Every structure is written in C-alpha cells, then in structure tokens.
Amino acid sequence: SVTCGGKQCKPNSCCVQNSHGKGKDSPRCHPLGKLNNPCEVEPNENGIYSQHCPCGEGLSCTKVGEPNKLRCQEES
C-alpha cells in the first residue's frame, strides 16, 4: 500500500514532490514510468521522486546516453 502526503494512494504510483516552496510538503500520486521514458534508479533520501516515476511495469532503468541519461527499458 502506497502512502503519500499523509494519504494512501493507489498501486503502481510513486510519490512525487510538487511543492513550490510553500512550506508544506504535499506530494502527488503519479503513474509508474513507461518504456522509452525518463526514469530514476531510486528516489531521494526521503523516498520521493520529482515528476516521473521509476520502472514498475516490466522495465529497467538503463543508461542510453550521457552523462547519466537513464531511460526505461524492458528487461530481458
């Protein structure tokens, strides 16, 4: 069970910070990253992402560019 912003969210959705510096960390529920899309290995020290979500639909963060342009790629 996922829990973001002091509220439980649906599965296949990571936590993302969407605060503009208001002082109240209020993340939002975003869908898991897809193929040929931008993804990150792991979240911050708190466990939250920026905008996109990590691979969770049968993908795997693989380096395709530089410096560290990690993208989602269906694992073999």
Curated annotation (Swiss-Prot):
The keyword Electron transport does not apply. Transmembrane segments: none annotated. It is found in: Secreted. Keywords: Disulfide bond, Ion channel impairing toxin, Secreted, Signal, Toxin. GO terms for cellular component: extracellular region. Disulfide bonds join C4-C15, C9-C29, C14-C53, C39-C61, C55-C72. It comes from the Eukaryota. GO terms for molecular function: ion channel regulator activity; toxin activity. Probable ion channel inhibitor. Belongs to the neurotoxin 32 family. This is U33-theraphotoxin-Cg1b. It comes from Chilobrachys guangxiensis (Chinese earth tiger tarantula).
